[model samples]
Target: ERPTFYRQELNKTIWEVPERYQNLSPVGSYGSVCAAFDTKTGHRVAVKKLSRPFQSIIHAKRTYRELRLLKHMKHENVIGLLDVFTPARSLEEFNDVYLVTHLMGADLNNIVKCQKLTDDHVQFLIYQILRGLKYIHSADIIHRDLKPSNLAVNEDCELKILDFGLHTDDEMTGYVATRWYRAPEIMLNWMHYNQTVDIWSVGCIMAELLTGRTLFPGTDHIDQLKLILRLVGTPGAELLKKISSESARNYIQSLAQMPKMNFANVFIGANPLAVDLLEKMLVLDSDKRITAAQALAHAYFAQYHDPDDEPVADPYDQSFESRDLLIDEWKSLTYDEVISFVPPP
Candidate 1:
């Protein structure tokens, strides 16, 4: 028989749950997500469970960071964390964690695969993405993994950024961003990367949305670099000098210089302004890539821009880097955040 659970708050309100409340199942590799209708509140919500979150040290660290960041972050375009709970109350007995958030029906990947997107749809979606990125970057957090699937979308074209497990600071290294959307600097094994890495991903996502296919569908990391070079051209000598890997740098130098395809030719039938923004985003040099705030201010979004649509200064204390929280400490921290979280007023 499956295990049953219940939670009681300090105020003596019991969270009554039923077996039939579960409405969905896990849809991704990371965790199990299910939806349920709360009879008391008469609202539907999604509950997520991390699979073996504490099985290893790395997994435990990621769990701590993701939970910490999600608890503190608040933005219109970022996915909200509504509630969190565990089957057991005390740290010694705690094993599973359940997180609640708004249930989005579809992801950008599925939408891009099935629907023929209009120019307006593309613009609005990309605008929301950049807006979300601006908010996240302002907190000095770099979303290491950015792909269409991570972006939740509604039928009305509403988009919210999700999946913060791989987020890191400016000084982080090692494998990050998905292969197709991974930035060139990261592919070259550069240690000190910044937020512009996400800009490269934005460029790839935009291209895919406009063209209805993955821009760099490579089978491996090396193949991914080749695909990137085919469209964006070879990096200049100055930019190549930034690659810390001797073998990778030499390999790039050995290849014939590939000329970049004109943005007009690449994104056929795309808006002139959209194509222009893509050029600024898909730069080989990470330093040369357009920032999220700058992209939002670009002419591509001129019609949608309002004078008051400035980046909101939501201050956060964490730098989004790795933290050393003991398992017991994490339990108490999680409990505090869950109890303190109130729906946006």
Candidate 2:
């Protein structure tokens, strides 16, 4: 049966998604997204009905993790979680969860593909991407998936980051950002990756905006790594030893060395400062990659950088203790977190 609406008894709010607003197109592997009018606030919103969260252990964990992060996070550049609810009367029957977020003009994917963006447009757009990254990293969270489509923008050039805190090591196969923006560590399956993964993504996105095409459009994982090496040059012998996987390191060593491309040549007509920043973000070694905060202060963004700053601190009530949860432990945690949640007033 096709479920049409989900109502929350506690708030007396009925989420009746009208037929006109429903977007039948599937986003990633998870949800059915649609635009809807919120009767209570009289505002239009993007509503997502998450797919079969409890159908698998990984699915369930991703659902809970995203929900928890969205609830605690507050930022101007990050998408606001307007509301969350489940139609299920009890946890035993709980299989569906709906999320409500602010509606935007269009995703950067659609924007970049359709529009011939100017230098001014590129500068402002990249600035907002880094600004949002700064906020997310400040909260000690890594937005594992960062891509053009995940970025929501408006006619006014306002951008908000979305779909964060969902990807985990186990659920890697299900996450759907194109391989073009993925970091080398992710491709090699290195377990000890960090915030730099996102920087790599931003670098690819910046290059795409300049070229109007993907920086490294690999067909698969190995091809992705090959493309990255072709542009960034081969990682030296010392760096290969750092990779935790012996077979991955061996495979890399077997491949013939590929010389790196000059940034000026690659990103034709881009400012020198912009090219310099791009090099910093696309480093093969995560340890050497530039940070989101540092990127903001780069000369490329000097016009946008503010000297007098309003600093942000990581929020309380958040914990990093859930570092590497095995499958069973992940399931248990998801159950507890989901069942215990209290919807905001």
Candidate 3:
């Protein structure tokens, strides 16, 4: 027997549930996500159980950093934390942590696979992403990872950026998700990259949405760069000189001279404005990439653009992102953040 809402009994595995949240089932296990019915609000909430967040000093520090940043965020187009908790009393016993955020329907990946999204639908969704990215970049936080699945959407087509919290096993290994959306600079293993890295991703996602296919779907990192160049054209000498890796610079110099795929052909039937925007965004140099703010103002989003409505956040306190912390120190600091979070009165 199991507890049923108005419907019928559903089932699940382990859950370290708090009183306010119930009806838990895993969304993605091992760093599991449980969609729980919250008593505080009628809508269900996503409870994220960050498994063994303190297992490693490197992982633990990032764990704390990820949480503080989540709480600092607030936007309609961006995700915000609602509550967080842990089920441990002694310092030695603390290993597990649970956090909460508003749960939506399937993510963009699922929706993209299932439905045929209209260009108008795609444009509105893209605008929301740029709006949220503008806010996030304003806070001096580069998403580092941005893909369609990391974006959540519901029936109304509202989008929110997801999974900026805890490092999954794939994340621990490195870029967990595919290199499908990474920028050329980041792919070359460059240390210095600006927020424009994310713009490359937005360009990839926009093309994906317009065509219902993965853009720059490279088998590996090297092939990834190859795929990008195939679409956007090879970089010139000025761009090549800037590549810090001599090995990488030589690789590009060796490739056969090629012209970019005409967007009219590659993104067949896509809106001309969208293709124009992609040309600006998918430039080889990060410096030349169109900004999130600029993307919002593009004629493609003319129907939706409103500078006053497109919000921006003040730079968040990233001082902690640079500082080091001991494992135990990070645990308690994170605990304070989780405990201090209270529902609005």
Candidate 4:
């Protein structure tokens, strides 16, 4: 049988997927892929495959830890996992779990490919991405890995943050995160690091969105930290001492780091708003880092709030719609509608 919307009333397990539609498409080069469909009276869903299987006990636990957390969290920005199907009967045995989710949209990395976006377009993206991060932070979940490859974009221009948090129990995987988007403290293995790492990556993503180039294109982990240090300035010894992890502390202390690599040369005449956002996000001290809410309310955003202040014609022309909308263009969009993208003009 096709198993049309199976569920157990007593145990309360439900998997209702419409049967009319077919699988949409594959998402990334690695990990897993999903597709959604609608049938005449029901729905169907399918997960393709895992990239690799855990070879050891530690590796399996590591992978499952993130799943455990995801199952409990319920937020609009975070991907919601519907259910996990594990074939193995015992805890000691290894079996891949098939996680079910109501399909989300395409990832941000794919949606923005080769598109030349305006500063405002990029700002919209940054704001929504931060909104997602804010939810994660509120939950006390530090997105150890943050980057574009981990970002998702819906049919609307709204940004969805796809943070791949590692399972603490897992001793698996030789590497983490893509090259350009890894945070400085993660490179140092700094236990002192927290949600601040996500802020640093937000800066990276913001720079890339505005300039269409990576902020820190480092060759290795040390090189990554050095690139960051050069741009944002180095952390002082007092701050460095917070890194109590032996390996992490040694990494930060070994370097005679630099401070303040200005954006003039790198951004190359990009909008000043882009530069301002970068500075606030990539600060050296974790404690001093700007939260998502603070960044959204900065002067850079306030500049174009009113008709008298805005230099260009309104894109959406929402000024006639509602006076309460600080920015007329975004007035018409619901929060979800706001993040959905418009194909570049």
Cα TM-score per model:
0.84, 0.80, 0.88, 0.66
**In what order do the candidates fall by TM-score, top score first?**
3, 1, 2, 4
RMSD versus native structure for model 1 = 5.9
**On lDDT, who's better, 1 or 3?**
3
Computed on alpha carbons, the lDDT of every model, listed in order, comes to: 0.75, 0.74, 0.79, 0.57
Q: Each prediction's Cα RMSD?
A: 5.9, 5.9, 4.6, 13.7
lDDT of 1 by residue, 170-220 (tens): 323323335678887876575479888899999999999999988887766
> How does residue 72 of candidate 1 score in lDDT?
66
Candidate 1 C-alpha error for residue 23, in Å: 6.1
Which model scores highest in TM-score?
3
TM-score of 1: 0.84
- Candidate 4's displacement at residue 335, Å, is 35
Candidate 1 colliding pairs: none
Give one clash count per candidate, in the order shown: 0, 0, 0, 25
lDDT tens digits by residue: candidate 2, 1-345: 323553322222234443324432223227766666666666677777776666665666677677778776676788867777555655565556777776776899988899989877889999888887888888788888898888998988888998774644454443235556778897668648888899999999998998888787766677777778888999897788789988887788898898778989888889888899999998888899999888888999877887555245466454534566565565556556645655345
Q: On a 0 to 100 scale, what is the lDDT of residue 303 in model 1?
A: 67
**What TM-score, to 2 decimals, does candidate 3 have?**
0.88
